[PDB]
Structure 1
Amino acid sequence: SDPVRQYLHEIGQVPLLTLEEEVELARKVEEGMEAIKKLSEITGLDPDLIREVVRAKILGSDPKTVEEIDQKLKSLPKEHKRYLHIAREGEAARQHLIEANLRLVVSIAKKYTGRGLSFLDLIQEGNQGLIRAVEKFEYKRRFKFSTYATWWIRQAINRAIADQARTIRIPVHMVETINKLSRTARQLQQELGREPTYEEIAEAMGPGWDAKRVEETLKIAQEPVSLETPIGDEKDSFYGDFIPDEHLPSPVDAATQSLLSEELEKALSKLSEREAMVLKLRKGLIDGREHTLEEVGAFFGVTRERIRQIENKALRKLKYHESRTRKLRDFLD
């Protein structure tokens, strides 16, 4: 029932590496990676293609072509088959090197909890940085693995928080900007003994910052609120029960639109057969789209000035009719 305890038990079955074992595994990965490069230069295929084929055999269990490429590599002579062996051992050493450092990520990941990601999310993201650490680690520098791996494990956790801890994703540059603003404000708060103002925070931030920018950054940093947040002691009301839907038209709005449509077509009946057609075509009352005097000059074969000539004349006659009946002004609001 406890996924965290289950994971810790799983990583507890891989013993920690001694320094001699750490160097041997680190050496094999570098030798294996170099062996893959030598193989590709000779066999002519993609270096990335070969490492997947070598990795597939080590892991075990397109499968059609993996055997074909693996058989081709084994078809090489004795001198070239040797480089395949280091590639196999190097990939196997990489798997064991990663497995024996799964305790390091847990120690690092526990320092990042409470920042929007669960503990298991932090570990898995930290594992991704650990895998990248193995690829970029160099044992020639005689530095221990934990010294260099810690940088990549912390890097992967930080990037995941900046990318996955918010419902509305915010880029890393703005997340690091939001983090700086809070740190600066907190430092000003403890020194001034009160909540800093936006002018005070902007001045402490440095050049290019004013109270307007601080307020906009805080506005951006506002997390969305849950629609299922309860109100009151009783568990029978939420925020969503008090938020009206402003997208769908109301029955009143739908009705007055229909009322306007039938009164407008009734007024257009007084117009001529062609004069009413032009307005319905120019205003998009038929096709739904406003057409140009040109797009209308092709439907009827008339000049762009013909339309503008009558379209106004039909418009003027509706103005006279409206002033005589006044059955259309109330829709104007």
Structure 2
Amino acid sequence: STSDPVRQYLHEIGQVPLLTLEEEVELARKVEEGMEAIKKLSEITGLDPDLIREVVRAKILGSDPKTVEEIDQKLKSLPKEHKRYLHIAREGEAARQHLIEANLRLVVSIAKKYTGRGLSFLDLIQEGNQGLIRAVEKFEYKRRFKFSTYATWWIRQAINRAIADQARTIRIPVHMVETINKLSRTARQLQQELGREPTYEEIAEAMGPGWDAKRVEETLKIAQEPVSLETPIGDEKDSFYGDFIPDEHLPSPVDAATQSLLSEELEKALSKLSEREAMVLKLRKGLIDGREHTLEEVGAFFGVTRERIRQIENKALRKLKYHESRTRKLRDFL
């Protein structure tokens, strides 16, 4: 007891008796009359219909509270003909709560058929509950159709969307998830028909126009779930995928060393240059501020025009070529 969350939830929803068809119509009528009453209230009292439905909902549920009482007392200040519409609004909200509560068995029966698709059983039910709430808002009892007929569309819609949105660590858009599901179904039908695993050409041909072997391969590559870093290898519980994946982001001690070796050798080579000529290359190549500068931007720092700096920058570049050729102390770092 209380250690199985599914069992505890089922017991909780089992405490609300199922609605007879008469009770369903009465509750459905009250919600529609209540929603219309909120519209009539807003039109007359002038505030936002969304604002009023929250105030009415707050009073029913009970327990910004500063303004809720201000609006609630304002609504009660209306005359009798207008306080009546408040009464239907309150009963409509109370009936909406009761109508949602009594259909919590419907979501469970629908949600039990969607297990094993990346979401847990309780996650499916809660997503089904969101669809059930949407069903009550849009349900119309004037058409004389029972609630389970129309709710089932919204309950399955919410479960499908949640799976397409929450069943993968790397989220894939709904349209592509539908494509991936359609691709897998098409492959399986060919696989059971041809008695072997179909090739990409065969899968693409069965899919239809606009599909080739390249697109099928890309879609399958996209549909590759990431693998856990903690999955063990072998019977011994001491090795995981994380123990065999090197880190290629941080520089290795060798890479950091040769970068320092290059930096100290380049500044030593630049010493042979003139005071200004070395400054131009270090600033044109971004060795001082970190970022490469332009001839115009370098020009403002020395007050020199664009064309002249290119000449001294090239002349300084040529002198380093002369020095490197006579020493060969810089070729190896390339």
TM-score by length of 1: 1.00
Displacement of 1:76: 0.2
2:13 is aligned with 1:17: no
CA distance in 1, matches of 2:297, 2:170: 44
Displacement of 1:167: 0.1
CA distance in 1, matches of 2:283, 2:174: 51
CA distance in 2, matches of 1:2, 1:25: 33
Displacement of 1:47: 0.2
RMSD: 0.2
Q: Secondary structure at the match of 2:171?
A: coil
Deviation sequence 1:75-134 (CA, Å, 0-9, x none): 000000000000000000000000000000000000000000000000000000000000
Deviation sequence 1:167-195 (CA, Å, 0-9, x none): 00000000000000000000000100000
CA distance in 2, matches of 1:229, 1:329: 46
Deviation sequence 1:245-290 (CA, Å, 0-9, x none): 0000000000000000000000000000000000000000000000
Q: Secondary structure at the match of 2:113?
A: helix
Identity of aligned residues (%): 100
Q: Secondary structure at the match of 1:111?
A: coil
State the aligned residue count.
Answer: 332
Displacement of 1:141: 0.1
Displacement of 1:33: 0.2
Displacement of 1:13: 0.1
CA distance in 2, matches of 1:152, 1:226: 34
Displacement of 1:301: 0.3
Q: Secondary structure at the match of 1:331?
A: coil
Displacement of 1:164: 0.2
CA distance in 1, matches of 2:236, 2:128: 41
Q: Secondary structure at the match of 2:168?
A: coil
CA distance in 2, matches of 1:242, 1:191: 41
Listed as ranges, the gaps of 5+ residues in structure 1 are none
Deviation sequence 1:269-317 (CA, Å, 0-9, x none): 0000000000000000000000000000100000111110100000000
Listed as ranges, the gaps of 5+ residues in structure 2 are none
2:148 is aligned with 1:139: no
Displacement of 1:6: 0.1
User: 1:314 corresponds to which residue?
Assistant: 316
Displacement of 1:54: 0.1
CA distance in 2, matches of 1:44, 1:79: 16
Displacement of 1:36: 0.2
